[PDB]
Amino acid sequence: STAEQKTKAKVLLEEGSFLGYEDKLRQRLKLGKDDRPSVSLWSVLKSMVGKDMTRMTLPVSFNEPTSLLQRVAEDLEYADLLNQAASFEDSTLRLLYVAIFTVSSYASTVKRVAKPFNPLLGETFEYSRPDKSYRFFTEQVSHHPPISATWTESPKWDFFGESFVDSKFNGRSFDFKHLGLWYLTIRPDSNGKEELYTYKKPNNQVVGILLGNPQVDNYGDVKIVNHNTGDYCMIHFKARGAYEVKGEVYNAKGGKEWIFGGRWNESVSAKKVLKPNSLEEMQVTSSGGPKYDGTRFNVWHVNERPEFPFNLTKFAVTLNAPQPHLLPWLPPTDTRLRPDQRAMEEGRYDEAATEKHRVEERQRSVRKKREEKNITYQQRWFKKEIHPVTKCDYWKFNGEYWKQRRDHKLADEGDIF
Numbered sequence: 001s002t003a004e005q006k007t008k009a010k011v012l013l014e015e016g017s018f019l020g021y022e023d024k025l026r027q028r029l030k031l032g033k034d035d036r037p038s039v040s041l042w043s044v045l046k047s048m049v050g051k052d053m054t055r056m057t058l059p060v061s062f063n064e065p066t067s068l069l070q071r072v073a074e075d076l077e078y079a080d081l082l083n084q085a086a087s088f089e090d091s092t093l094r095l096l097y098v099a100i101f102t103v104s105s106y107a108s109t110v111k112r113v114a115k116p117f118n119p120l121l122g123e124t125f126e127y128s129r130p131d132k133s134y135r136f137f138t139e140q141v142s143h144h145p146p147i148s149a150t151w152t153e154s155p156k157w158d159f160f161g162e163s164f165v166d167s168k169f170n171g172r173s174f175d176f177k178h179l180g181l182w183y184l185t186i187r188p189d190s191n192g193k194e195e196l197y198t199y200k201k202p203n204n205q206v207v208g209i210l211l212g213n214p215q216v217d218n219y220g221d222v223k224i225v226n227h228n229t230g231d232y233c234m235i236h237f238k239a240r241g242a243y244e245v246k247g248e249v250y251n252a253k254g255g256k257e258w259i260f261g262g263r264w265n266e267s268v269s270a271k272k273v274l275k276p277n278s279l280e281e282m283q284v285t286s287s288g289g290p291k292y293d294g295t296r297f298n299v300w301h302v303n304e305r306p307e308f309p310f311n312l313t314k315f316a317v318t319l320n321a322p323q324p325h326l327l328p329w330l331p332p333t334d335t336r337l338r339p340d341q342r343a344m345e346e347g348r349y350d351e352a353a354t355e356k357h358r359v360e361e362r363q364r365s366v367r368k369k370r371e372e373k374n375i376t377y378q379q380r381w382f383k384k385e386i387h388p389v390t391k392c393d394y395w396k397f398n399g400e401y402w403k404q405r406r407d408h409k410l411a412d413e414g415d416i417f
Ligand SMILES: CC(C)CCC[C@@H](C)[C@H]1CC[C@H]2[C@@H]3CC=C4C[C@@H](O)CC[C@]4(C)[C@H]3CC[C@]12C
Pocket: 041, 053, 058, 062, 071, 072, 075, 105, 109, 112, 113, 114, 115, 116, 165, 174, 176, 201, 204, 206, 216
C-alpha cells in the first residue's frame, strides 16, 4: 500500500463510510416472481412517437423498481478490475484494465427492457461496501433535464461523473445517449503518481420493437485518455445489424500495446501486441492473469444471473435493500425510502401508482412556488465547478455527506417523499 492509498483509506474510515453496512447483503426480493402481464412494447409506443423516456406514461410491465441513481451504481459491479488495474506497474496495462471495467457494466442491461424510476429532484443514494473498501454517493441535481451526479471513493481509485441521458423514440428504435464526462482516478501500487482517465459511455438502444422481441443493444465508439501519461484506448461496441466489443490500447507515441475483445454480455479477453505498428484487432485460454508474450488471457466474465423478479442481477438486488442497520443512518432523500419504488419492488402496483402521483405532484408544486418567489434551486451535496485537468464543468462533491451522516445531522436534509 502506497502513502496516498493509506491516506485515502484513512479518510474513508474516519468519515464513517462503512457504518450502517453491517447487515449481510440482500440476496433476494420479497416477491418470488411476479406476473405483470407482458404488454407489447409497440402497442404502447406507437402513440408516443418522438417523445422522451421521461415524457411518456407506461404500464407497469415496462417499469422496474430501481432508480436511475442505482442503475448508475451498477457501474461498480465489477470494480475489482480497478484494484487489479492499480496493481500493474505498466501504465498501458492499467489502461487495459480500466478500459475493460468500462465495458463490464453493460452485461447487466440485458433482459431489462423497462424504465427505471426517474429520480426526484434532490433524491440521493448511498452505497458502501466494507468488503471492497469503496463508498458510492449520488444526488439527482437536476429534474429538467434529469441529471445525476456521482462520486465513488476507494483507497486505490476514485470514480465520478455526470449522468445526463438524452433519449428519443424515433418510431422504430429507442435511442439513449450519455452526454456527461466520466472521471476515473487510479493511485497505482508503483511506478506512477495518481493518474486521471476520462471517457464517455457508449449509447444504448432498444431495438426489436417492431419485430415483437425488444432487445437492449449497446453501441458506439468510446475513447479513454490517461491525462498523465498519456496512453489512450479506442473501444467499439458494435451496433446490432450486437454484443461484440473490441478495443485497442496505445501508448502516447501511438504504439499499439494491447488489444481486447469479446461479447459484452459474456466475457472479454486480451493479448499483448508485440509489434507497435500492427493493425491486428481482436478476433471474436490462460485464466492466470496478464501475459506479455502475446498469448491470450481472460480479463472479465459475467457473474451468474439467477432468475429474480424484474430480471435483476444479484448485484442489483443489493442496491435498494432497506437493511435494518442502515436505515437509521440515511437522509430522508435516500432512494431506499422512496415509497412508490418500494411498493413496486414488493409487487403492489396500485399503491406504487398512488404514491408516484403524490410525490410527483409535490415535486411540481415545490417547483412552482420556487418560480413564484424567484428562488434559484441549489443542490445540496454537489456544486458545478470547472475541472482543472479537463477544463469541463463537473459536479464537485462538497465532501460533507459522509461526515454529516457520521454525526447524525441528516434528519432535516430534504423532504421529498
Ligand atoms: C419504455 C421502456 C421500454 C424503455 C426502456 C429503456 C431502457 C432499456 C434504458 C432507459 C434507461 C437506460 C439506462 C440509463 C443509464 C445507464 C447507465 C450506464 O452507465 C449503463 C446503461 C444504463 C443502465 C442504461 C441501460 C438502458 C436503460 C435502462
